[PDB]
């Protein structure tokens, strides 16, 4: 058992009710091309083409053999491209239920399958993109293995869903996915969770680890840092509970399981709750008549690390399990910086808000101030639980000293690991993009 | 790049440079001694009230303005009279005569003293018209003369004649004097009762009265020897009972 | 007086003792013995060298030759060699060309490695087939107002085992040449007369080496064709001395003798199926002709191909017959030419402007997937930069843009 | 006991070779951008100084001092050239060691590795030893302390410059000008020992 | 011809202190007085010129192992003979030189130019290079000395141009101009001005 | 309204306007009066409420009790000394010859021996306010000049530097000297390095060091700490060095200086340093809010106590400074002011929790050492802080290298 003591449980309004209900009927899905790290697509379809479920849409130039397949059966209606012809989404309009089928195995045959057969089935089905490698958070090359696969059976993000409610419906699929992963790994499988009970695999090399504390107690970066530190020559893989259920369903039935149970929540949602949806569902149709009037921002994922869902990007991400909606803070206040903040949240104690314990805030998308230099009053140390030097690592990230940042521990990090650091910066910096730039430089350098 | 070539070129260059350096160093030694004698005589005479402005007039100004005389420096008696050009440090090289590890060791940090000290009473015609006496101590090599006014010892101005060289031309804080442009006139730090004292005051008073040494700003460091090299003026070791013999009689 | 003797003798003794100590320390702090540069772990090819100098000099004197674009100046970065055993650190003059990923494998610039101890290398590509030849000039007829076609007769009727896109370094002795020796025809002279370029001259006092690309493809046995442009001083400063080596090459006539170095090169085609697009301009027609002729006449590949060439005017076009024949005979190959500055007597009716503008506004703008093709480039640096920028704006990735220029 | 600790502390802090006497400034300002190389330069300077000072002490006391060899024979004018010859031989052996064992430190020094000979700190230490008339043990302690103080100053400057990776210096001031200003600020920082009579 | 070009280049284009780093210690030390700055400038110029000449005369015979010994023997002999002759005859200025004979030997410009130019050039061009480096060094020395002496004592070359409150004027001297931090700041700002008027000397972003 | 005004004259300061060079000043004024009204664009779509404006406004508000007590104390000390020296007609002639005194008497106050707290604070204000105004204007000139030339935007930090510099000078400092000091501190120590958040030295203590070493007679001695005409008097740190605890006596009133007097602030000195009580009340608020570092403050206290107790244990026969205890070291000089408001500068301190302890311990040790064993300076807080500003990055280096070794051992 590991207890995290440095962190922040963000008190934003509109937490969902942990009861599952069916969602709005969805007529369009898409695969967003900019959310895959180090990916350059080779198109296999074009507008007007009719596809089937698990039919390949495009491949990767930089990762030979990786296939990105269609969540549902329908017709390709849009291929969205932006500046310098960068792929933004391949939108499919649902029609029919044709699909591509695979092999099905019994429940007890999964733990002893061949690793190459497992890899072949995953790559062909397109479920191989559920994995991500630390460092660099990329899809694993189809000719590589790892000694550790980390399963994320917990969720500490603001307004996140409870994995227990979802897993308890699909215990057999979860356990089958765990068996498949145990046969797939060369070392062990780490199931990182809370203190509640989950369905358990009987394989000796599948081990459940319990983490306590506030956010980020539920991040794969924290789990790797505490159980299997990653470096250039030690690489770990990550996957979450919904994708493990999908793996189990695929190997038990021979069909791609594209269902999702996401959380619809936010300060401007009338009835926050959990809704059943489909992979890459259209968010403008998912949130149709679910929110209060006004100008709002719909976010695919958390507010700490999510993707703004507007225009061609208004679809559910591959690695996102919630939708966050909140208002737009474009108001201007007279001497607003000097007011006593009874309704203002801060990790410091310069406002009256912290004296009301349990208070819940109707947060918006405001930047409470302007961009400035770094004056280190010691806020990053309150939110970084890892064994690193936050201020110094952030200053190398800002200055662009990639060689020094690698020594200081950048290879262990993802954009979601610096979300609270971006949160509590008085200089209004944004460290996820700086970390991504440094990691891109390290990758390209060799 | 071979041993023979290396050794030959090294030896040749060493000989060629060393012979020139030795010639230019020791072959001028007598001339350097004459230069030192001139810059001692003229330097002391210019404040002695006689305008001995170099070899253009030294031939008619030296030995026609002063006469040699030397004393014990501890009993107030003459023992011989060769002190026309005499330095006490040159005669103190014989061990540590009369000992210098006594209470005044602060000024006597050199721990070396001849049994005879230099004196200069400007007694060309055997009359004591003016008096000058040297100080000589460690702490930035403080070794100086003083003339002061008629009240205790002499007359007019001294400016603390420097013997040969000041440590720096102005690099750092060190005021033994403002070079030769001293603010001195009728200075007074001695006592007629064997009890003088001196500290860091300056500030307007020294232009006539007393206490004209600062020596630095912010350290009091490389002038501490200068400001402490007059605490030795309690007599006995310093020209004996001379400073109660000032303007008294006899030697006067 | 005796003080002088004492000073001299004591100084000399002290200095001699110091120098003797220095020599004693050096005796045990330098190896002073010879070393062996083993190559691919072979008992032969092992080179015994005096422990000093740069690795390139020892390699050249030992009979193993590598790229010398800068000629040992270390500003080229083309002499990369794989070092396995101890060879020291990687000098900062190398970090500008070798990245860390291949710096781990041992790739180093031979211009900077000084041989101090024994070490092991790994020569790549089996370059041991490089050999010097004393060639014979066959013809030197002009092809453009500033470009000439040169044919080389290899001695003893040999044939270079070269790949399309390879290059050779020509070397010349000391000489002094006048531009009056040139034999440009009158219909090309209509510009040389008005610029009075015959008065120019160049001289050579010590031998030099310059690398040139070859315009022939492997089924052209026994000969080596080159396209050479005269290195005239820039028009803004006519007084500047002209290009020595280009002046030398422009002066030779049939029956003369010249010496080449050997077959090198890295600008080779890719072994995929995808579409092929070739972009050449001015004097860059040599590697393009090599590549297209190798692809079509020898390989008989069915890949889709396209060649876009940009000449200054109708006066500067050449190999038109060969490319027209290839385009007519092959349905896969299609040819286009764009004149930057057409003139009234040219009476041109085709595309004008820059070749990259023509290519974009005719072919790549309406293309289904411009990022799936392979682009090969050779020409002026301004055209290279403009075409690279245009291709980058279309989402084309770097590993699909193959570029060979005139010296990196 | 107390005498030698007083001497060591004085040399390191009260009379600092770099930020109190201001000697060694050329290489102090040039080679102080990385702590990794500044540490090696400091160690090399420590070795050179602590070996050169006592050797010159012996040479002065046994050869060049007046009346040290023969009565009346004074050789006190060979002082500078003898001292610089000893320092140059030591630096020659040091270069021989460095070119073989530490190529990364041979580089990033380049033209300054021979100029360790004309580092003003070494010659100033030897001249101060002659002036103060230390003994052999005091010479060893004084040389070691002076080298340690110079290393401390150069490593402090290297750390400051490494921290300045986040600064935004005007283009005409980056490098030498800002290094001069930084050293002038460090001198003001070190001015707090000025009045100590240790 | 090339003579004026070569003597005037190191003044502003290849300045020993402003573009190289050589002579900084003496530049900090002797710039509280214009007379001392002038004397030091002349001494360094003369010594560097003669040392370059004498080193270049025998550049083909110096072994690599004893090169520093040979160079410093020549330089030290030159400086010592200069000091001896100055003491013998020019006693007046030799007294205000005094403790400064030592820094001339260990001045970085002398041996740096001997290493970089004298060992691969001709005698007369080496002499010209020494004179040019002396001029470049003196430019910085006298520019700093002007400001330091003026603002610290109201005097130039000893002649009083700003009357002092101590003697009955209107000016209060700045006591930081008599300390080395002021020399540091002045040299930094002069480097700023030089690299602003000649932007080709700006160092690359690192 | 002001809002419609600020949105009406906005075009003049965009490119193409009649005032396109004063855009920095317009933006500064606009964002002072109203919040920017911007939104997040990349990630962490919600942000914290804190910013540099609040960070510096709290620190500026934290020194108000100290500033007001300093004004009152300066006035009262000057009045007491003047009535000690002069009386009757000579007092009238002295008052008529000084504009501070006759303006205090003209604004309704009194300068006699029975003056009140209002008159004392008015007299102290006549000394404090001109210095603060000069400092702010002269420093703002350089800040705005650098921002306009280099196309940055003016930022807070000078808001704190100005008041901290104006609160640590003697009440009798010349205004031209104040202008020179603020110029040096702003330009040399901070602006050439990039501005706020990009220097390594303390700007407020860098101009004070310039004044200290350039014009010593106006910032040291006996004639500068009480603003009375012709009054000479030593202060408590300069009296202990001479005679110990028996030498602490207020000459103007004939009363001994007690520990309660030193703690409350009834002593001469720099304007804002005197009241340890007020400084502690001010510093507690910003330590609670999370702006100042309790690690740094605790380190300073630890070092001070350790060295000041070692000196007491060793003892001396000639130095009366060897027997001053820690509770006396605390309530004299600028120790409390420095430890609470200058040692806690985030940019000049260490960036590591382990390094902050060493930073504070070094500051305290150096302050006590300069106080005791250095006879030139009676106080050493400014020099101690400027000395630790050079070695903070070395503590950071040591901590980081230990962390990197731990990381390489695969346990961190
Ligand atoms: C793989 C490869 C292939 C190549 N293929 C070809 C090819 O097919 N055709 C071809 O022509 N070249 C080719 N080159 C370039 C070739 O190597 C030579 O650079 C070129 O032939 C001219 O060289 P040169 O020595 O005659 O002239 P250089 O003297 O090297 O060039 C100097 C040019 O600048 C002018 N100039 C001289 N001095 C100055 C000065 N001080 N300031 C300003 N201007 C000055 C000269 O008048 C002349 O125009 C190739 C290079 C490589 C590496
Ligand atoms: C930077 C500086 C600070 C000084 N501080 C004091 C002081 O605090 N108290 C005092 O009485 N004199 C002070 N002085 C003036 C002293 O007289 C100073 O120590 C003296 O000038 C030392 O140099 P001099 O005695 O060799 C200071 C002088 C300077 C330059
Ligand atoms: C932050 C701060 C730092 C100070 N630093 C010094 C210093 O370094 N040296 C000094 O003489 N006085 C310094 N002072 C001033 C003294 O602390 C004190 O105010 C003044 O000397 C009064 O006399 P003191 O001897 O009792 C400082 C004051 C403050 C507020
Ligand atoms: S002159 Fe260069 S180190 Fe002193
Ligand atoms: Ca004495």
Swiss-Prot record, chain B:
Q: Which domain of life is it from?
A: Bacteria
Reactions that this protein is recorded to catalyse: a ubiquinone + n Na(+)(in) + NADH + H(+) = a ubiquinol + n Na(+)(out) + NAD(+)
Positions the record marks as coiled coil are none
Q: Does the UniProt entry include the keyword Coiled coil?
A: no
**What InterPro entries does the annotation carry?**
FMN-bd, NqrC
GO annotation terms (biological process): sodium ion transport
Q: Per the record, what is the consequence of mutating residue 211 to L?
A: Decrease in FMN binding
Q: Which terms in the GO cellular component ontology are assigned?
A: plasma membrane
State its Enzyme Commission number(s): 7.2.1.1
Instruction: Identify the SMART domains for this entry.
Output: FMN_bind
Name one molecular function that GO assigns to this entry.
oxidoreductase activity, acting on NAD(P)H, quinone or similar compound as acceptor
Cofactor(s) in the UniProt record: FMN
Q: Where primarily located?
A: membrane
Q: Which residues carry this modification: FMN phosphoryl threonine?
A: 220
Q: What class of enzyme is it?
A: translocase
Q: Which keywords belong to this entry?
A: Cell inner membrane, Cell membrane, Flavoprotein, FMN, Ion transport, Membrane, NAD, Phosphoprotein, Sodium, Sodium transport, Translocase, Transmembrane, Transmembrane helix, Transport, Ubiquinone
Q: Transmembrane ranges? A: 7-27
Q: Where in the cell is it found?
A: Cell inner membrane
Q: Show the Pfam families listed in the entry.
A: FMN_bind
Its biological purpose is as follows: NQR complex catalyzes the reduction of ubiquinone-1 to ubiquinol by two successive reactions, coupled with the transport of Na(+) ions from the cytoplasm to the periplasm. NqrA to NqrE are probably involved in the second step, the conversion of ubisemiquinone to ubiquinol.
Family under the similarity heading? Belongs to the NqrC family.
* Oligomeric and partner information: Composed of six subunits; NqrA, NqrB, NqrC, NqrD, NqrE and NqrF.
* Protein's name according to its UniProt entry: Na(+)-translocating NADH-quinone reductase subunit C
Q: Which organism does this record belong to?
A: Vibrio cholerae serotype O1 (strain ATCC 39541 / Classical Ogawa 395 / O395)
Give the classification, highest ranks. Answer: Bacteria, Pseudomonadati, Pseudomonadota, Gammaproteobacteria, Vibrionales
UniProtKB/Swiss-Prot annotation, chain C:
Which ranges does the record mark as transmembrane? Answer: 4-24
Q: Which molecular-function annotations from GO does this UniProt entry contain?
A: 2 iron, 2 sulfur cluster binding; electron transfer activity; FAD binding; metal ion binding; oxidoreductase activity, acting on NAD(P)H, quinone or similar compound as acceptor
The EC number of this protein is 7.2.1.1
Q: Which residues form a coiled coil?
A: none
Q: How does it sit in the membrane?
A: Single-pass membrane protein
Residues forming the 2Fe-2S ferredoxin-type domain are 33-127
Fetch the SUPFAM superfamilies from UniProt: 2Fe-2S ferredoxin-like, Ferredoxin reductase-like, C-terminal NADP-linked domain, Riboflavin synthase domain-like
Which CDD domains does this entry report, sorted A to Z? NADH_quinone_reductase
Limits of the FAD-binding FR-type domain:
130-270
Which EC class is this protein assigned? translocase
Q: Tell me the compartments it is located in.
A: Cell inner membrane
Reaction catalysed? a ubiquinone + n Na(+)(in) + NADH + H(+) = a ubiquinol + n Na(+)(out) + NAD(+)
| Binding-site positions, [2Fe-2S] cluster | 70, 76, 79, 111
Keywords (A to Z) from UniProt: 2Fe-2S, Cell inner membrane, Cell membrane, FAD, Flavoprotein, Ion transport, Iron, Iron-sulfur, Membrane, Metal-binding, NAD, Sodium, Sodium transport, Translocase, Transmembrane, Transmembrane helix, Transport, Ubiquinone
The UniProt note on the cofactor reads as follows:
Binds 1 [2Fe-2S] cluster.
Q: Does the keyword Cell division apply?
A: no
User: Which cofactors, if any, are listed as required?
Assistant: [2Fe-2S] cluster; FAD
Give the CC-aspect GO terms. Answer: plasma membrane
The UniProt family comment states: Belongs to the NqrF family.
Q: Which NCBIfam families match?
A: nqrF
Question: What is said about its interaction partners and assembly?
Answer: Composed of six subunits; NqrA, NqrB, NqrC, NqrD, NqrE and NqrF.
Q: Report the function annotation for this chain.
A: NQR complex catalyzes the reduction of ubiquinone-1 to ubiquinol by two successive reactions, coupled with the transport of Na(+) ions from the cytoplasm to the periplasm. The first step is catalyzed by NqrF, which accepts electrons from NADH and reduces ubiquinone-1 to ubisemiquinone by a one-electron transfer pathway.
Name this protein carries in UniProt: Na(+)-translocating NADH-quinone reductase subunit F
From Swiss-Prot, chain E:
Instruction: Indicate the principal place this protein occupies in or around the cell.
Output: membrane
List the EC numbers from the record.
7.2.1.1
Membrane topology label: Multi-pass membrane protein
Q: Where are the transmembrane segments?
A: 38-58, 68-88, 99-119, 127-147, 174-194
What is the top-level taxon of the source organism?
Bacteria
**Which Pfam family, an example, fits this chain?**
Rnf-Nqr
Q: Name one GO biological process term.
A: sodium ion transport
UniProt KW keywords:
Cell inner membrane, Cell membrane, Ion transport, Membrane, NAD, Sodium, Sodium transport, Translocase, Transmembrane, Transmembrane helix, Transport, Ubiquinone
- What is this enzyme's catalytic activity, as reactions? a ubiquinone + n Na(+)(in) + NADH + H(+) = a ubiquinol + n Na(+)(out) + NAD(+)
Classification via InterPro entries: NqrD, NqrDE/RnfAE
User: What cellular-component terms does GO give this entry?
Assistant: plasma membrane
The molecular function terms in GO held by this entry are: oxidoreductase activity, acting on NAD(P)H, quinone or similar compound as acceptor
Give the EC class as a word. Answer: translocase
Q: Report the subcellular localization.
A: Cell inner membrane
Q: Which family does it belong to?
A: Belongs to the NqrDE/RnfAE family.
Q: How does it assemble?
A: Composed of six subunits; NqrA, NqrB, NqrC, NqrD, NqrE and NqrF.
Record's function text: NQR complex catalyzes the reduction of ubiquinone-1 to ubiquinol by two successive reactions, coupled with the transport of Na(+) ions from the cytoplasm to the periplasm. NqrA to NqrE are probably involved in the second step, the conversion of ubisemiquinone to ubiquinol.
Query: Which NCBIfam families does the record associate with it?
Result: nqrD, PRK09292.1, PRK12405.1
Protein name as it appears in the record: Na(+)-translocating NADH-quinone reductase subunit D
Swiss-Prot record, chain F:
- Keyword check for Flavoprotein, yes or no: yes
Subunit structure and binding partners: Composed of six subunits; NqrA, NqrB, NqrC, NqrD, NqrE and NqrF.
> Pfam families of this UniProt entry?
NQR2_RnfD_RnfE (PF03116)
Q: Which HAMAP family match?
A: NqrB
Q: How does it sit in the membrane?
A: Multi-pass membrane protein
Q: Which cofactor does it need?
A: riboflavin; FMN
* GO biological process terms held by the UniProt record: respiratory electron transport chain; sodium ion transport; transmembrane transport
Q: Which NCBIfam families match?
A: nqrB (TIGR01937), PRK05349.1 (NF003756)
Effect of altering residue 184 to A? Decreases riboflavin content
Annotated keywords: Cell inner membrane, Cell membrane, Flavoprotein, FMN, Ion transport, Membrane, NAD, Phosphoprotein, Sodium, Sodium transport, Translocase, Transmembrane, Transmembrane helix, Transport, Ubiquinone
The record's GO CC annotations read: plasma membrane
Family per similarity comment: Belongs to the NqrB/RnfD family.
Organism field: Vibrio cholerae serotype O1 (strain ATCC 39541 / Classical Ogawa 395 / O395)
List localization entries. Answer: Cell inner membrane
The membrane-spanning stretches of this chain are 22-39, 55-75, 128-148, 163-183, 274-294, 296-316, 324-344, 357-377, 380-400
Question: What is this protein for, i.e. what is its function?
Answer: NQR complex catalyzes the reduction of ubiquinone-1 to ubiquinol by two successive reactions, coupled with the transport of Na(+) ions from the cytoplasm to the periplasm. NqrA to NqrE are probably involved in the second step, the conversion of ubisemiquinone to ubiquinol.
Sites of the modification FMN phosphoryl threonine?
Answer: 235
EC identifiers of the protein? 7.2.1.1
The family database entries (InterPro entries) matched by this protein are listed as:
NqrB, NqrB/RnfD
Q: Which GO terms describe its molecular function?
A: FMN binding; oxidoreductase activity, acting on NAD(P)H, quinone or similar compound as acceptor; riboflavin binding
| Record-given protein name | Na(+)-translocating NADH-quinone reductase subunit B
């Amino acid at each position: 058992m590991i207890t995290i003591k440095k962190g922040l449980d963000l008190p934003i309004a509109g937490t969902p009710s942990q009861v599952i209900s069916d969602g709005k009927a969805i007529k369009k899905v898409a695969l967003l091309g900019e959310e895959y790290v180090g990916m350059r697509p080779t198109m296999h379809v074009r507008v007007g083409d009719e596809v089937k479920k698990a039919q390949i849409l495009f491949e990767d130039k930089k990762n030979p053999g990786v296939k990105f397949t269609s969540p549902v059966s329908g017709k390709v209606v849009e291929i969205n491209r932006g500046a310098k012809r960068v792929l933004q989404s391949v939108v499919i309009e649902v029609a029919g239920d044709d699909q591509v089928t695979f092999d099905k195995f019994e429940a007890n045959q999964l733990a002893s399958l061949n690793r190459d057969a497992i890899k072949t089935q995953l790559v062909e089905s397109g479920l191989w993109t559920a994995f991500r490698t630390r460092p660099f958070s990329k899809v694993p090359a189809i000719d590589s293995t790892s000694e550790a696969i980390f399963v994320t059976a917990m969720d500490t993000n603001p307004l996140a869903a409870e994995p227990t409610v979802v897993i308890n419906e699909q215990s057999e699929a979860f356990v089958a996915g765990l068996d498949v992963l145990s046969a797939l790994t060369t070392g062990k499988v780490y199931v990182c969770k809370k203190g509640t009970s989950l369905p358990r695999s009987q394989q000796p090399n599948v081990e459940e680890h319990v983490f306590d504390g506030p956010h980020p107690a539920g991040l794969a970066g924290t789990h790797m840092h505490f159980l299997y530190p990653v470096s250039a020559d030690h690489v770990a893989w990550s996957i979450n509970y919904q994708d493990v259920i999908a793996v189990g369903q695929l190997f038990l039935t021979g069909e791609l399981y594209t269902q999702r149970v996401v959380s619809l929540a936010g300060p401007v949602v009338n009835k926050p709750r959990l809704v059943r949806t489909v992979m890459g569902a259209s968010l403008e149709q998912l949130v149709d008549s679910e929110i209060m009037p006004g100008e709002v921002r719909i976010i695919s994922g958390s507010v700490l690390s999510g993707t703004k869902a507007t225009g061609p990007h208004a679809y559910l991400g591959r690695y996102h399990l919630q939708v966050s909606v909140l208002r737009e803070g474009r108001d201007k206040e007279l001497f607003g910086w000097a007011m006593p903040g009874k309704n203002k949240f801060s990790v410091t104690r310069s406002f009256l808000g912290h004296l009301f314990k349990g208070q819940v805030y109707n947060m918006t998308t405001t930047t409470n101030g302007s961009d400035r230099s770094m004056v280190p009053i010691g806020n990053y140390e309150k939110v970084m639980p890892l064994d690193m030097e936050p201020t110094l690592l952030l200053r190398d990230l800002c200055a662009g000293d990639s060689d020094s940042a690698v020594r200081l521990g950048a290879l262990e990090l993802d954009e979601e690991d610096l979300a609270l650091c971006t949160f509590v910066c008085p200089g209004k910096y944004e460290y996820g993009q700086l970390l991504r730039e440094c990691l891109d430089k390290i990758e390209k350098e060799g | 790049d071979s041993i023979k070539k290396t050794l030959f070129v090294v030896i040749a260059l060493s000989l060629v440079c060393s012979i020139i350096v030795s010639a230019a160093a020791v072959g001028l030694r007598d001339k350097q001694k004459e230069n030192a004698a001139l810059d001692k005589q003229s330097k002391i005479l210019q404040v002695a009230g006689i305008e001995a402005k170099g070899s253009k007039q030294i031939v008619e100004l030296f030995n026609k303005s002063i006469e040699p005389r030397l004393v014990d420096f501890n009993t107030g008696d003459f023992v011989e009279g060769d002190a026309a050009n005499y330095d006490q440090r040159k005669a103190a090289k014989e061990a540590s005569e009369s000992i210098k590890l006594t209470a005044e060791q602060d000024k006597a940090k050199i721990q070396r003293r001849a049994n005879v000290g230099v004196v200069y009473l400007v007694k060309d015609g055997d009359k004591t018209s003016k008096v000058i006496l040297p100080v000589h101590g460690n702490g930035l090599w403080s070794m100086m003369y003083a003339f002061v006014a008629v009240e205790t010892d002499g007359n007019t101005v001294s400016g603390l004649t420097y013997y040969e060289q000041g440590e720096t031309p102005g690099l750092g804080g060190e005021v033994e004097n403002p070079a030769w442009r001293a603010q001195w006139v009728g200075k007074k730090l001695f006592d007629e009762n064997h009890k003088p004292a001196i500290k860091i005051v300056k500030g307007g008073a020294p232009q006539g009265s007393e206490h004209g040494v600062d020596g630095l700003s912010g350290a009091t460091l490389t002038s501490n020897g200068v400001q402490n090299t007059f605490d030795f003026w309690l007599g006995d070791m310093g020209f004996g009972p001379f400073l109660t013999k000032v303007r008294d009689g006899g030697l006067n | 007086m005796s003080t002088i003797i004492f000073g001299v003798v004591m100084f000399t003794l002290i200095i001699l003792a110091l120098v003797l100590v220095i020599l004693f320390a050096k005796s045990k702090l330098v190896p002073t013995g010879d070393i062996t540069i083993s190559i691919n772990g072979d008992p032969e090819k092992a080179i015994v060298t005096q422990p000093g100098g740069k690795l390139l000099t020892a390699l050249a004197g030992a009979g193993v030759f590598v790229s010398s674009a800068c000629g040992g100046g270390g500003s080229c970065g083309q002499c990369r060699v794989k070092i396995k055993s101890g060879g020291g650190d990687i000098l900062p003059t190398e970090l500008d060309h070798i990245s860390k990923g291949e710096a781990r494998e041992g790739e180093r610039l031979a211009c900077q490695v000084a041989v101090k101890a024994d070490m092991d290398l790994e020569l790549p590509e089996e370059i041991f087939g490089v050999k010097k030849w004393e060639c014979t000039v066959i013809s030197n007829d002009n092809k453009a107002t500033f470009i000439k076609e040169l044919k080389l007769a290899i001695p003893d009727g040999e044939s270079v085992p070269f790949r399309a896109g390879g290059y050779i370094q020509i070397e010349a002795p000391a000489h002094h040449v006048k531009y009056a020796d040139f034999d440009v025809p009158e219909k090309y002279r209509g510009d040389w007369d008005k610029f009075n370029l015959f008065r120019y001259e160049s001289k050579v006092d010590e031998p030099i080496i310059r690398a040139y690309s070859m315009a022939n493809y492997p089924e052209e046995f026994g000969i080596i064709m080159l396209n050479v442009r005269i290195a005239t001083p820039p028009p803004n400063n006519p007084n500047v001395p002209p290009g020595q080596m280009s002046s030398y090459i422009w002066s030779l006539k049939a029956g003369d003798k010249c010496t080449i170095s050997g077959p090198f090169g890295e600008f080779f085609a890719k072994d995929t199926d995808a579409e092929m697009v070739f972009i050449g301009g001015g004097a860059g027609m040599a590697p393009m002709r090599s590549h297209i002729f190798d692809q079509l006449k020898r390989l008989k590949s069915k890949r889709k191909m396209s060649y876009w060439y940009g000449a200054r005017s109708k006066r500067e076009m050449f190999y038109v017959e060969d490319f027209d024949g290839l385009a007519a005979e092959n349905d896969n190959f299609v040819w286009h030419c764009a004149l930057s500055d057409p003139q009234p007597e040219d009476n041109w009716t085709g595309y004008t402007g820059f070749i990259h503008n023509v290519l974009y506004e005719n072919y790549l703008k309406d293309h289904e997937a411009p990022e799936d093709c392979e682009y090969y480039m050779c020409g002026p640096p301004m055209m290279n930069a403009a075409v690279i920028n245009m291709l980058k704006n279309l989402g084309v990735e770097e590993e699909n843009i193959l570029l060979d220029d005139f010296g990196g | 006991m107390e005498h030698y600790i007083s001497l060591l502390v004085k040399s390191i802090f009260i009379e600092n070779m770099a930020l109190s006497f201001f000697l060694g400034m050329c290489t102090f300002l040039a080679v102080s951008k990385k702590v990794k190389t500044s540490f090696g330069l400091g160690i090399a300077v420590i070795v050179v100084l602590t070996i050169s000072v006592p050797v010159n002490n012996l040479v002065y006391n046994l050869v060049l001092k007046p009346d040290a060899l023969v009565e009346g024979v004074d050789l006190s004018f060979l002082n500078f050239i003898t001292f610089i010859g000893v320092i140059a031989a030591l630096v020659q052996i040091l270069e021989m060691i460095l070119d073989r064992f530490f190529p990364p430190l041979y580089n990033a020094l380049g033209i300054f590795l021979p100029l360790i000979t004309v580092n003003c700190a070494i010659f100033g230490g030897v001249s101060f030893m002659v002036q103060r008339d230390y003994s052999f043990a005091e010479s060893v302690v004084y040389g070691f302390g002076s080298g340690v103080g110079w290393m401390l100053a150069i490593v402090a400057l290297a750390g400051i410059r490494e921290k300045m990776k986040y600064s935004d210096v005007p283009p005409g001031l980056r490098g030498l000008g800002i290094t001069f200003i930084t050293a002038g600020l460090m001198a003001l920082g070190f001015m707090s020992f000025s009045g100590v009579q240790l | 011809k090339e003579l004026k070009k070569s003597v005037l280049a190191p003044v502003l284009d290849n300045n020993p202190i402003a573009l190289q780093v050589l002579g900084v210690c003496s530049a900090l030390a002797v710039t509280t007085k214009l007379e001392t700055a002038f004397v030091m400038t002349l001494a360094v110029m003369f010594v560097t010129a003669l040392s370059n000449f004498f080193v270049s005369l025998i550049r083909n015979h110096i072994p690599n192992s004893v090169r520093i010994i040979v160079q410093m023997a020549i330089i030290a002999s030159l400086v010592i003979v200069v000091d001896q002759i100055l003491k013998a005859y020019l006693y007046d200025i030799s007294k205000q030189l005094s403790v400064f004979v030592g820094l001339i030997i260990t001045n970085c410009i002398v041996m740096g130019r001997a290493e970089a130019f004298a060992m691969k050039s001709e005698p007369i061009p080496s002499f010209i290079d020494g004179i040019g480096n002396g001029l470049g060094y003196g430019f910085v020395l006298m520019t700093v000395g002007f400001f330091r002496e003026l603002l610290g004592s109201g005097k130039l070359f000893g002649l009083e141009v700003l009357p002092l409150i101590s003697n009955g004027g209107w000016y209060q001297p700045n006591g930081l101009m008599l300390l080395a931090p002021s020399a540091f700041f002045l040299i930094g700002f002069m480097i700023w001005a030089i690299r602003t008027f000649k932007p080709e000397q700006v160092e690359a972003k690192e | 309204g002001l809002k419609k005004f600020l949105e009406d004259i906005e075009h003049h300061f965009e490119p193409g306007g009649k005032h396109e060079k004063w855009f920095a000043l317009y933006e500064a004024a606009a964002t002072l009066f109203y919040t920017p009204g911007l939104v997040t664009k990349r990630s962490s779509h919600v942000r914290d409420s804190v910013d540099l404006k609040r960070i510096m406004i709290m620190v500026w508000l934290a020194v108000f009790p100290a500033m007001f007590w300093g004004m009152y104390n300066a006035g009262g000390q000057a009045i007491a000394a003047l009535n000690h020296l002069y009386s009757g007609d000579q007092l009238a002639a002295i008052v008529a010859g000084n504009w501070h005194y006759w303006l205090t008497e003209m604004l309704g106050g009194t300068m006699s021996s029975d003056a009140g707290w209002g008159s004392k604070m008015l007299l102290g204000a006549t000394y404090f306010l001109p210095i603060y105004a000069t400092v702010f204007i002269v420093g703002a000139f350089w800040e705005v000049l650098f921002c306009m030339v280099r196309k940055h935007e003016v930022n807070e930090g000078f808001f704190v530097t100005s008041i901290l510099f104006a609160l640590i000078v003697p009440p009798t400092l010349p205004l031209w000297q104040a202008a020179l000091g603020i110029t040096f501190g702003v330009v040399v120590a901070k602006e050439v390095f990039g501005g706020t958040g990009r220097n390594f030295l303390n700007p407020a203590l860098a101009g004070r060091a310039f004044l200290f070493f350039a014009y010593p007679a106006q910032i040291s001695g006996d004639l500068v700490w009480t603003a009375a005409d012709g009054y000479s008097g030593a202060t408590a740190l300069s009296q202990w060095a001479q005679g110990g605890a028996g030498a602490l006596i207020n000459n103007a009133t004939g009363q001994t200086i007690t520990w309660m007097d030193a703690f409350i602030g009834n002593i001469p000195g720099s304007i804002g340093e005197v009241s340890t009580l007020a400084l502690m009340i001010g510093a507690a608020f910003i330590v609670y809010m999370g702006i100042a570092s309790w690690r740094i403050i605790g380190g300073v206290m630890i070092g001070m106590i350790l060295l000041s107790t070692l000196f007491n244990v060793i003892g001396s026969d000639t130095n009366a400074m060897f027997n001053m205890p820690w509770h006396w070291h605390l309530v004299l000089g600028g120790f409390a002011f420095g430890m609470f408001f200058m040692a806690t500068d985030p940019v000049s301190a260490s960036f590591t929790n382990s390094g902050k302890w060493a930073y504070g311990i070094l500051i305290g040790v150096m302050c006590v050492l300069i106080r005791v064993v250095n006879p030139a300076y009676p106080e050493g807080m400014m020099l101690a802080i400027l000395f630790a500003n050079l070695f903070a990055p070395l503590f950071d280096h040591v901590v980081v290298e230990r962390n990197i070794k731990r990381r390489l051992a695969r346990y961190g």
